[PDB]
A paper describes a structure:
Before the glycosidases can act, the terminal glucosamine of HS must be acetylated by the integral lysosomal membrane enzyme heparan-α-glucosaminide N-acetyltransferase (HGSNAT). HGSNAT catalyzes a unique transmembrane acetylation reaction where the acetyl group of cytosolic acetyl-CoA is transported across the lysosomal membrane and attached to HS in one reaction. We find that a central pore within each monomer traverses the membrane and controls access of cytosolic acetyl-CoA to the active site at its luminal mouth where glucosamine binds. A histidine-aspartic acid catalytic dyad catalyzes the transfer reaction via a ternary complex mechanism.
Rather, the acetyl-CoA binding site forms a continuous positively charged pore as the binding pocket that allows it to transverse the TMD and position the acetyl group at the active site at the luminal mouth. Acetyl-CoA binding then fully opens the pore and positions the acetyl group at the active site located at the luminal mouth of it in the priming state. This configuration of the substrates binding and the active site is the structural basis for the transmembrane acetylation reaction. The CoA moiety interacts with HGSNAT through an extensive network of polar and hydrophobic interactions: a large number of polar interactions at the cytosolic mouth stabilize the 3’-phosphoadenosine, while R345 and R275 form hydrogen/ionic bonds with the diphosphate; the pantothenate group is accommodated through hydrophobic interactions, while the cysteamine forms a hydrogen bond with M282. The carbonyl of the acetyl group is stabilized by N286, whose mutation is identified in MPS patients. In addition, N286 is positioned 2.7 Å away from the carbonyl oxygen of the acetyl group, which stabilizes the negative charge in the intermediate state. Aside from being an integral part of the reaction cycle, the lack of extra density representing the acetyl group in the [CoA] structure compared to the [Acetyl-CoA] structure helped us to precisely model the position of the Acetyl group. The ligand(s) bound structures as well as the Apotrans structure adopt similar structures with a dilated configuration where Y361 folds back into the interface and interactions are mostly hydrophobic.
Numbering used by the authors:
A (entry chain A): 76 to 171, 176 to 228, 265 to 663
B (entry chain B): 75 to 170, 177 to 228, 265 to 400, 407 to 663
């Protein structure tokens, strides 16, 4: 009857001489049009109101505006938040103006109230018990037959493993929860964090591997060849394997999505690694005093790259806020569709979307952006577009900066911690200035689809804080080893390609008894993520590390 | 036009007034099929204006048309014609009743120009493109620099031939009928790879077992390795290879338990454990026959297993079905056994695994219109798969016992090939549908096993001197997949739909485009195997 995250709204219209139409919009919309929910006829006679049934969305908030069909006047307005499976009744009547009362016939399922952390810890206990029993069964079976007859940081690795586990969880569905999906246009969800963290970690590893290779006595040209080959392979693997849905049919060139996650990673890797190789200064030595020296030797040594990154960021800001888009406001950052009151429907992405549609074409972009379900956008927008690559490069260079911090001051963790704290604080201040700590307001609101500058600064401050926490615990104090996380940290590309390839396979996806149940989807996605962690751990035990 | 691939437009118009015509169709290859209706041709309203009809007749191989008056059910005429692909034929029936079937436009051969010189042209194109890709990329790098126990290889070649053929026929084989699995009885090019794979698996079982045991390894560690490999093969087949995940998520009550890799694992376990249990060191000749008497317990057990297969096939009473039924069911055998596909083997696997846990689209479903699910890699045929794996083990025994006696190996290979060919001739009477046990991949018939074993022994007889002794030709396109068989199979199952192997065609009703796509995909899989060989990334177990 009712789908997932969808209540039932019964609308009894007791008025005699007024047609009734009901409009609905979410509270997550910034400026959305009022979609038609249902049209309720007038009551044929007193005491027998006419009723119409509507299925309202539950995920986040709801606004109801009831208007007459004849005169189009506001009868009454509602801002109720509905439950996942409810039988709400909306009675409109003339008590005198007209007073409408909303009644909850059946109480909500109250999603996230029942599962809480109790269900999650129970599922973890169950899977741990099953894994232990499976491990112990091998010994009993064997006995029965026998009776008859530089080193890796591991903080970067734990960070990458956290990102990979979260990415596998949110990519497989994340329980089909709205906060485990990418945000529609603006704001930040759990699924919007992993990709910037992946780019940040990629930049950090770029600096780490490049400086290790250069200090081992390697030529710059061979390293450039390796960088070019890796970027080319990333782009090709993305385009051929990761982007297309091969269950829909054979891959035609006219409908090939050129941009993608791996294409963005390859392009940014090439750009920032080539910048690092062009300006590659050896890691110098400190004063060996530990007396709060606070030397800015890890920024002035890279001012080449800082100047070029600032030029690229200025280019991104100019192309975003200044490039004229035909039939579209200059400097448009909205989602289009019904967003911004539906006056710019074919404007999803503004300048970034325009540049993507111009250079690559509509057919070669992402056909189903995140805004399509909330703002009802019809144009194809690619989150990993062309303008966003500039900010992807900027964040990869911030990750390179983190690697420079943790390599220049490798001797003392005090300097590393202060550098990480200062960078996190500065990036957080920049993000607060840009977005005014607001989801949809601010100069540049946080936006994964546009890869906003505030998106980059917010997620970079998050990654710097994550490093500030993980580096002492995992490395200096050694209190933790990233115990379940670092195996994906070592087999990141294998995990990504595998879960993009084996997404529909049985251990990661099976048929559920109820597909509208959040609990079943969450159980399946958690099991699949745990199985990918298990696969990464098994490969780690076998010393198998696929590297490009 | 509206003509699908392998179809001809048949325009039937009758210049007659006082009879209604219904046209029946029956492909020539089917053994005993009911005449399925094709089209109903009504009376012409008046003389001089025949009433026309349209029908798309299959042109894969032959066609028999039964035109009988639907009012009285008497055949006005019956003609057997080999229609051409994309043809346009006018079956004119009128009083003199005479049927002629004139030709309106010429058909398309679809096989001669596509495989006479098109194959050479495509091979030239692919080798030129590969050379250009390998050279131009390296040309830029060279220009920039200026500015700045051993494997036999005949078994490997045989396995690579089987893998190339399997990749070609699984991907479609150009959608040609002779590159698909035969509808029930008979042999096609696609019906040879799996028995060859089982034969090679048995030969490799013996070679690996002898090497491991002569190296001093214990029998229990080897038994654990056997069990682990069989379990892994079964699990891979069940989880990765069998399901079509493009349809939807996997449910237990709709999962195909049998399969290619499951059967390979079961036969590997049985044959390898038999060899390990009755394991003897190879001794150290013109007329010795020692490699047959040494494995007399295994031969006795294989004879008992074959007798059990014969007894279950020809004596097990299947309810609602004739005993010893080797036919395909459906409209085959005059449609008197509509649900009898496989007979005893189908009954056994339906009773033990259920209709849901079988292959829901048997190869006979298109020709004989069978409605039951029959699994070619079922339960009863696993006995014959074990037998053919043991024949492969015998080939490995021949290879290893007479290692230094090439003439002895050749004599043994030709003797086994001739003996198994004689058995196949006796069982089939050289006939696809006649004989005591006709050749059948779906049933994995005993004569199927013996025919493919004689073929494999002849292949080995031709390959052993050339690739090993005389060194005339290493399996230079073939051993590269031969040493990565499991990777090639699993990858081509997983990446079947991916771009290098599949892309959207200009028209899917074209044998030329499909053949080009499948040959390109097979060549790309050979190239992937060669790349893995060059980097030594042989995946095993
Ligand atoms: C939005 C969603 O929900 S889905 C979006 C998902 N986004 C993604 O980016 C997922 C896919 N991406 C990835 O998996 C990764 O970003 C990758 C594989 C592309 C890049 O991984 P990277 O972080 O660049 O590191 P990778 O493991 O490939 O190794 C690169 C180099 O860094 C080195 N390195 C890695 N970790 C460390 C470490 N902790 N310390 C030192 N060196 C390290 C490696 O040794 C290697 O150098 P080498 O080749 O000279 O030996
Ligand atoms: C019907 C259709 O169109 S599709 C159906 C066809 N598909 C199939 O049959 C599935 C694909 N099959 C296969 O890939 C293979 O048959 C397999 C991998 C499943 C079977 O493995 P095998 O054929 O025995 O070969 P594999 O390469 O795995 O060799 C296994 C052992 O034999 C040894 N071996 C293999 N070839 C040789 C050789 N030429 N000389 C010596 N030893 C050899 C290996 O060393 C290994 O022993 P080890 O563990 O001691 O090292
Ligand atoms: C529902 O009715 C209200 C009230 O009549 C509408 O809001 C006002 O009226 C016009 C449209 O008639 C709006 O454009 C104005 O912005 C509102 N204020 C004033 C002062 O007019 C509302 O637009 C109606 N909703 C729909 C979907 O028709
Ligand atoms: C209400 O809607 C009905 C449509 O069924 C229409 O016939 C009627 O005239 C409407 N009444 C008013 C007051 O608009
Ligand atoms: C909702 O409640 C009304 C009365 O309270 C009842 O008639 C109706 O069947 C209920 N609907 C559902 C889906 O439970
Ligand atoms: C042939 O069929 C047509 C319509 O189906 C019918 O009108 C006619 O009477 C039939 N002729 C004979 C001889 O049955
Ligand atoms: C067509 O009619 C003839 C008349 O003898 C009959 O023998 C034949 O079986 C018919 N074809 C069918 C029923 O398919
Ligand atoms: C087949 O030939 C006839 C000749 O009368 C013609 O009318 C018909 O259009 C042809 N069919 C096609 C598909 O061209």
């Amino acid at each position: 009857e009712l789908k997932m995250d969808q209540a039932l709204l019964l609308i009894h219209n007791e008025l005699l001489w007024t047609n009734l139409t009901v409009y609905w919009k979410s509270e997550c919309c910034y400026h959305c049009l009022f979609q038609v929910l249902v049209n309720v006829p007038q009551s044929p006679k007193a005491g027998k109101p006419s009723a119409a049934a509507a299925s309202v969305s539950t995920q986040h908030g709801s606004i109801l505006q009831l208007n007459d069909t004849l005169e189009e006047k506001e009868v009454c307005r509602l801002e109720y938040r509905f439950g996942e499976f409810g039988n709400y009744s909306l009675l409109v009547k003339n008590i005198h103006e007209i007073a409408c009362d909303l009644a909850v016939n059946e109480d909500p399922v109250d999603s996230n109230l029942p599962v809480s952390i109790a269900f999650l810890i129970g599922l973890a206990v169950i899977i741990v018990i099953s894994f232990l029993r499976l491990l112990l069964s091998l010994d009993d079976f064997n006995n029965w037959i026998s009776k008859a007859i530089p080193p890796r940081l591991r903080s970067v690795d734990t960070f990458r493993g956290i990102a990979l586990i979260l990415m596998v969880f949110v990519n497989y569905g994340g329980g089909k929860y709205w906060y485990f999906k990418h945000a529609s246009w603006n704001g930040l969800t759990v699924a919007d964090l992993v990709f910037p963290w992946f780019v940040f970690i990629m930049g950090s590893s770029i600096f780490l591997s490049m400086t290790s290779i250069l200090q081992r006595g390697c030529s710059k040209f061979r390293l450039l060849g390796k960088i070019a080959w890796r970027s080319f392979l990333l782009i090709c693997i993305g385009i051929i394997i990761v982007n297309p849905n091969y269950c829909l049919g054979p891959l035609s060139w006219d409908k090939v999505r050129i941009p993608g996650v791996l294409q963005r990673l390859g392009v940014t890797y090439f750009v920032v690694a080539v910048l690092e190789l062009l300006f590659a200064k050896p890691v110098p030595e400190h004063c060996a005093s530990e007396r709060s020296c606070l030397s800015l030797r890890d920024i002035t040594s890279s001012w080449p790259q800082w100047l070029l990154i600032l030029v690229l960021e200025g280019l991104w800001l100019g192309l975003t806020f200044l490039l004229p888009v035909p039939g579209c406001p200059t400097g448009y950052l909205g989602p289009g569709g019904i967003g911004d009151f539906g006056k710019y429907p074919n404007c999803t992405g503004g300048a970034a979307g325009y540049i993507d549609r111009l250079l690559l074409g509509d057919d070669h972009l992402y056909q189903h952006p995140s805004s399509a379900v909330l703002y009802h956008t019809e144009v194809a927008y690619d989150p990993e577009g062309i303008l966003g690559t500039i900010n992807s490069i900027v964040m990869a260079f911030l990750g390179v900066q983190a690697g420079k911090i943790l390599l220049y001051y490798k001797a003392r963790t005090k300097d590393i911690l202060i550098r990480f704290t200062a960078w996190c604080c500065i990036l957080g201040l920049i993000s607060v200035a840009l977005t005014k700590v607001s989801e949809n307001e601010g100069f540049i609101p946080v936006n994964k689809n546009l890869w906003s500058l505030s998106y980059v600064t917010t997620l970079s401050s998050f990654a710097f804080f994550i490093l500030l926490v993980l580096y002492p615990v995992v490395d200096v104090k050694g209190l933790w080893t990233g115990t379940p996380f670092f195996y994906p940290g070592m087999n990141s590309i294998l995990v990504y390609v595998g879960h993009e390839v084996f997404e529909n396979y049985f251990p990661f996806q099976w048929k559920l008894k109820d597909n509208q149940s959040h609990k079943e989807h969450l159980t399946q996605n958690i099991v699949a993520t745990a199985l990918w962690v298990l696969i990464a751990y098994i490969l780690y035990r076998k010393k198998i590390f696929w590297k490009i």
